């Protein structure tokens with residue numbers, strides 16, 4: 001049931017990212033309305049700029065968390081699908097790729113990886129020859145809503161915010177800044 | 188009635204009210220003596236009197252109450268405060284007290300307090316269970332203060348240069364080392380007026396020594 005745990009973690013990350021962007025947008029709108037006036041709360045204006053920076057950094061961190069969680073979930077799902085189908089139909093695949101399996105059965109490491117690359121590039125050329133047809137295929141048998149609700153790709157809001165690159169010094173300074181943010185919020 | 192309004196007023200208005208209140212030979216002496224005698228005759232008439240100030244405690248425990256306008260001078264304008272107010276009312280040193288005052292009786296040079304109405308801009312009742320200054324755990328300069336006026340003033344360039352060179356923050360500990368003839372006095376007055384204009388909530392005062 002590790003698959004379902006992965007899906008639950010991915011959904012939790014997505015919901016956390018969505019609510020973090022919600023409070024982010026609330027922060028920008030509140031800061032804009034307070035900045036509409038002149039010199040009223042200059043110190044609070046600086047605090048609002050700081051909170052905008054903290055919120056955007058934390059949104060970027062949550063987006064990265066969600067991206068890697070989704071990548072892991074997709075990897076595990078495709079691993080499970082390929083594994084089950086391959087136990088179903090491994091004999092014909094072995095028959096069509098016999099010389100490489102005889103090579104891998106007893107040869108040494110260098111010949112092992114030589115057979116590895118022979119098998120892999122032969123199957124790449126076969127795949128690129130076949131995919132010229134480009135037919136359309138639905139999802140798996142019991143993995144329909146898995147590939148439906150998770151999404152083929154992460155949302156467009158998750159790609160325009162993760163392009164900013166922050167060095168580890170920026171990450172740690174923003175982490176401690178959010179630490180005193182949480183300390184103030186507790187009070 | 189409230190002595191602050193008749194304290195911050197200039198000498199001319201005070202002397203004019205002196206003649207119009209019935210005492211015309213109260214001009215050739217100190218401001219403290221003038222206000223002391225005027226308030227003495229005013230309270231002798233039997234009218235309501237209000238006072239305010241900042242207190243301090245001597246070595247014996249008996250305390251004085253000075254005024255900000257008089258630069259905390261030991262003139263007659265001070266008000267006697269007993270240690271009993273400290274012992275039951277739970278008032279610490281330097282607490283700003285505003286409320287009723289009592290005309291001192293025979294042998295008492297300084298005024299006394301009848302009751303307290305406001306302590307540190309707060310009700311006297313909840314000032315008893317107030318946390319001490321040293322008991323508060325400190326931190327670093329979390330908040331940032333901006334010295335720019337924002338109106339494009341003709342002298343805003345100095346404040347902007349100060350901000351660029353060394354930003355200032357709340358609760359920070361800073362020094363301005365300077366030789367004489369450095370123009371420091373007016374840059375301190377400039378930052379004082381800047382924080383007064385930009386921040387009307389925080390309290391501002393400037394300490395002048397010798």
Ligand SMILES: Nc1ncnc2c1ncn2[C@@H]1O[C@H](COP(=O)(O)OP(=O)(O)OP(=O)(O)O)[C@@H](O)[C@H]1O
Nearest residue numbers: 342344345346365366367368369370371372373374
């Ligand atoms: N931003 C400025 N604009 C114009 N003049 C300036 C500025 N800063 C310094 N000065 C000049 O520097 C000199 C300093 O004069 P000022 O009386 O303000 O000095 P001070 O350091 O406060 O005095 P002191 O050390 O003698 O108590 C003056 O000639 C003043 O015109």
Ligand SMILES: [Mg+2]
Nearest residue numbers: 370371372373
């Ligand atoms: Mg000077």
